[PDB]
Amino acid sequence: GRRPARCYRYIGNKPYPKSRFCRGVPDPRIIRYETGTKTAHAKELPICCRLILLEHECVSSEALEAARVSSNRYMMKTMGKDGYHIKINLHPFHVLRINKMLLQTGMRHAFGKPEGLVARANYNSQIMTIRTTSAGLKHALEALRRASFKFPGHSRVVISNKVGFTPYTFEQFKELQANGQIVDCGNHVKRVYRR
Amino acid sequence: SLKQYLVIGRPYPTKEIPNPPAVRVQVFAPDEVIAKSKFWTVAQRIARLKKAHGEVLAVKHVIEPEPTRVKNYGVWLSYRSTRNHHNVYKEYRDTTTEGAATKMLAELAGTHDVSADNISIIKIAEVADKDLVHKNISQFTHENIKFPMLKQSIRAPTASARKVFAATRPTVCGF
Amino acid sequence: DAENKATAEGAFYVPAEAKFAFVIRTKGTNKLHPDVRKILHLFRLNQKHNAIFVRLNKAT
Amino acid sequence: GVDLDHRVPRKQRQEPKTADAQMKMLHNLYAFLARRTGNDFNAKIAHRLCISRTNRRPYSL
Amino acid sequence: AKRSNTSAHNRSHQHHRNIHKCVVKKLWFEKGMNAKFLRNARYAKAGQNK
Amino acid sequence: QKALKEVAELRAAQEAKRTSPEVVKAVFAEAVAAQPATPDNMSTQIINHIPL
Amino acid sequence: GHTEGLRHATRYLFARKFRKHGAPAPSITLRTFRIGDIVDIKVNGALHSGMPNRVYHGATGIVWNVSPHAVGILVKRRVNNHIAPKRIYVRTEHVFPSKSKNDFVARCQANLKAHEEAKKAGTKIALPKRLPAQPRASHVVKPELIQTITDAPFRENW
RNA sequence: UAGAGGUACUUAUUUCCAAACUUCGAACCUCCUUGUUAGGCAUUUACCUAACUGGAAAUGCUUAAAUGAAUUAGCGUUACAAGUGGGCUCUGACCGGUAAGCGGUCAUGGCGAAAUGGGAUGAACCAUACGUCUGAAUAAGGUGCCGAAAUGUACUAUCACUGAUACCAUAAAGGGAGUCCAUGUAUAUACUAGGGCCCCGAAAAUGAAUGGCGCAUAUAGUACUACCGAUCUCAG
């Protein structure tokens, strides 16, 4: 099954990805990182709403899929697959290991086979987002409150100043749009550098 | 105790730019030697000026025009606690700017439990009675203030004349 | 007077820096790094509460 | 508490380890001179009389 | 059975009790060097003293 | 001991200039001039939601 | 699995910088050496005949032999207790004229320039020497830009 | 990871990564130099050069001018021989492990072989490393009583079968119109950005330990003096 995740919280080795050398690895629990109206716009869904982690530790793949399903099913219930856009901004690349044990040969040839994927967070790493309209900003905060109980440690839910997932404030966005320096890609904002 | 200081410093002349901009910082420290080090902390942190290339021109000690009378003091500060930074406007009633700043380091260490390492003041200034908006300090600017001294002290009037016996019992009533 | 001249003008008289110092050894011998007691042996400050005058330049 | 190196690396022979009268006697003669006249010649003759028999090698004719 | 493999804790201490600078006797090393050079360097010295 | 009486006087004569009513109000005016403008709002994040 | 090979743990030593691959310029082969000359060994990763060891990369020595393509270099490795001498042979394409002495030799000739020219007028000499960076004379400073630095109120900005 | 633009690929982007990826690249390190340096003169060579009144090298002569960073310090060399070849560990860096008073390395320090004082008690932590004595003033650490020394002065919090001084002798995620301080708005009042202290979350076996007694302004923070206190320091 699994260990309790208090086993694999803090980081006591170098990072250990899926590669030539690791070999016998099971694939992660996550497939979809991103749900809702993916094909939308910066201008259509300006209001954004992040979940920031306040610890330096490992986050499991099992936590991140629990957080997606609890996020979707609240936002499906309230407003009904139109406005919202959910995204997950951790990708689990670190592979865990086990000594197994299950007569026995314990602590001899201690290196162990990979058990599961994990994501290494950093103090103030955003581990989730919800982009939405001003009508359902209320619903976005109540979603990320529920998603925070999935994750280890403690974790602040924050309304961002900046538009979309773009790195531009609402004050800056009108000045660049007006200037005509910025442009619109199918999704997100692509700047014009005049070169 | 803390003394208000004004420190002005500058970077050395390069051949590219002789006579650069100097910069001043208001600092609060027990003596002239500590006041330099508080200046180099704030100058490095903000205006990008290091100890290893800069003069320091004038440590001016700010004495009060009058310490005879009482003034109100607004103190805008940030203080840092684990996981967050908070901005607070707090105010005080005192003879001088230093004694207000010495008060709030005790009050933050008391009430919020943060040391002077974490605290970073924005603005101290004296403030009039009209613009003053906090209720517990506004009461002392009114006329006809009575409060009793409930709970008197038992101390020695001089440290020679203390004693650990008494025939009669002391009365600690306000009266 | 060189200080009081500059204040009346506008400027600042910055003073001359200290040409030498006086260096009390405060802490004793033991639990100490070998580079950092090679350096004390060069000032001849071997015992606790010892002192000499030391000239100030970017070497010292 | 003082930081010094207390050990002696170098001993030196001060007076002779012979139990003769005569070698001990004329050591004190040239020791007396080597001090008092203050000269490089007599200082060497004083010290040569200190040193063991192996180092006093037999200088052939 | 299983005791320690190595340590370097107090290698530094022992080395510094005494890192004596071993000085070279002379810069030429006539076992090495070109023979054709040293061959001629003999006939410089041999011709001079006569 | 004659010289260190004279130097004691001259260093004390500077403290007459430092604690004069004329000089102290200039230094306090410099300290009042140095302080920044009053902040309208505290709080970590202002939060602006202008349409577009 | 610790190994004691010749070219071991030299992934990045004998790498060839970046846009400096290929053979060297033929100006390098035209350069000359002498006995007594101070030279620094740093390696061409390309030219494989007559390398030094990995250890004597970035290592100053003195030339003692010179030979048709290669230079015998005396270099002081630190052994265990003591500083041993090591007689290297190594090719000229791993060897450059070191600028250790060029501070010293500049001063000696600059001193003789001063010591002679003092006597030419004569007159009488002041003696120059090197000196660490020294604490400053007093002097007076007027600026006319004075900013007033203060700490701002903290805001998150995400 | 996920869209847009072209004819599954592809041109620009984007979310987010690598001990066995690198187009950039620190800190900390490391190695060489710092007194003799410029010449000029003419012998030697079977070597080098097309050639010698050249080169290369060593032998002497000599023309000039000086001892040309800091701080410290006498330096060099040989012989004979003991014990040892189980180590352990604080603070940081690290490999394996769920973790360990676990196993294996690294740097300085400590113990082993180091007393004395302090942490009630302790090999390892802090002050300090010691002849026998007599004083003074201190360090670490302390000053209700046990216990030598202020229940010190000035300023803020706290009611709980509760709290009480590094290493250290355990407590988390998550809650609270308890109280104090507090951010932004709306109309004395409603809505909350939060912060401390206190409470809940919080259950083991002999009767039980902030060291004890006890305290509630002897609890939690902050500032400034006085004072006790080591085999250190100083004086004899």
**Cβ G153–B122 below 8 Å, yes or no?**
yes
Any A CB within 8 A of G155 CB: no
Strands A47-53 and A125-132 turn out to be antiparallel
Nucleotide at minimal C1' distance from the A13 CA: H95
Which residues on chain C are in Cβ contact (under 8 Å) with B24? none
Angle between helices D22-36 and D40-50 (to 10 degrees): 150
Provide the experimental method for this PDB entry.
Answer: cryo-EM
Measured in angstroms, the CA of B125 and the nearest CA of chain C are apart by: 26
Residues B12 and F33: beta-carbon distance below 8 Å: no
Structure tokens at A102: 């299950």
Q: Which residues pair with A87 in a beta bridge?
A: A34, A129
Give the DSSP H or E segment for B22: strand B22-29
Q: Which residues of A169-186 are buried (b: 16+ CB within 10 A; e: fewer)?
A: bbeebeeebeeeebeeee
Maximum alpha-carbon separation in chain B: 84
Q: What is the CA radius of gyration of chain E?
A: 24
For residue B36, the SS3 value is helix
Q: Does residue G156 sit at the F interface (CB-CB below 8 Å)?
A: yes
Neighbours of B10 (CB within 10 A): 22
A51 touches A127 (CB < 8 A)? yes
The C-alpha atoms of residue C10 and residue G144 are separated, in whole angstroms, by 10
Chain B residues touching G141 at Cβ < 8 A:
10, 55, 57
Residue E22 CB neighbour total at 10 angstroms? 12
- Residue in A194, A164, A167 with CA at minimum distance from that of residue A179: A194
Q: Residue G96 corresponds to which tokens in the numbers above?
A: 């450059």
Of A43, A159, A170, the CB nearest to F50: A170
Neighbours of B21 (CB within 10 A): 14
Residues in C closer than 8 angstroms to B8, CB to CB, are: 12
Helix (H) or strand (E) holding A68: helix A61-78
Determine the Cα–Cα distance for residues B23 and B46; give it in Å rounded to an integer: 11
Residue B3 near residue B26 (C-beta atoms within 8 A) = no
Q: Which strands make up the sheet holding A125-132, listed edge to edge?
A: A34-36, A85-87, A125-132, A47-53, A155-159
Helix (H, G, I), strand (E, B), or coil: what is residue D38? coil
**Is F44 part of the contact surface with chain B (CB cutoff 8 Å)?**
yes
G93-123: b (≥16 Cβ within 10 Å) or e: bbbeeeeeeeeeeeeeeeeeeeeeeeeeeee
CB A112 within 8 Å of CB A95? no
Tokens representing A98 are 């086990």
Alpha-carbon distance G114 to nearest alpha carbon in chain B (angstroms): 27
Contacting chains of E (3 CB pairs or more, <8 Å) are G
- Nearest-CA residue of chain D relative to C42? D3
Distance CA F35, CA F38 (A): 9
Q: What is residue C50's three-state secondary structure?
A: coil
Residues contacting E29, CB < 8 A, separation 6+? G64, G65, G72, G87
Check if the beta carbon of residue B125 is closer than 8 Å to that of residue B91: no
- Nearest partner of B53 among C56, C2, C20, G133, judged by Cα: G133
**CA A155, C1' H198: Å apart?**
25
Question: Which of strand H's nucleotides are less than 7 A from any protein C-beta?
Answer: 1-5, 12-20, 22-24, 30-38, 43-47, 56-59, 64-73, 75-77, 86-89, 94-100, 102-110, 126-130, 152-157, 173-174, 180-185, 193-197, 217, 220-224, 232-234
Contact between B87 and F42 using a beta-carbon 8 Å cutoff: yes
Contact between residue A61 and residue A116 where contact means Cβ atoms under 8 Å apart: yes
Task: Give the span between the Cα atoms of B21 and E37, in whole angstroms.
Answer: 68
* Neighbour count for residue C50 (Cβ, 10 Å): 14
Q: SS3 for E40? A: helix
DSSP category for residue D41:
H
Closest approach of D40 to chain C, Cα-based (Å): 34
CA-based max dimension of chain G = 74
Q: Is B174 helix (H, G, I), strand (E, B) or coil?
A: coil
- Alpha-carbon distances, residue B170 vs B151, B157, B158, B160, E19 (angstroms): 11, 14, 17, 19, 79
Alpha-carbon distance A70 to A49, whole Å?
16
Distance CA F27, CA A84 (A): 59
Closest by CA to G146, choosing from F43, B31, C12, B92, is C12
HSE-CB of D41 using CA atoms within 13 angstroms = 2
Residues of D in contact with C48 (CB under 8 A): 1
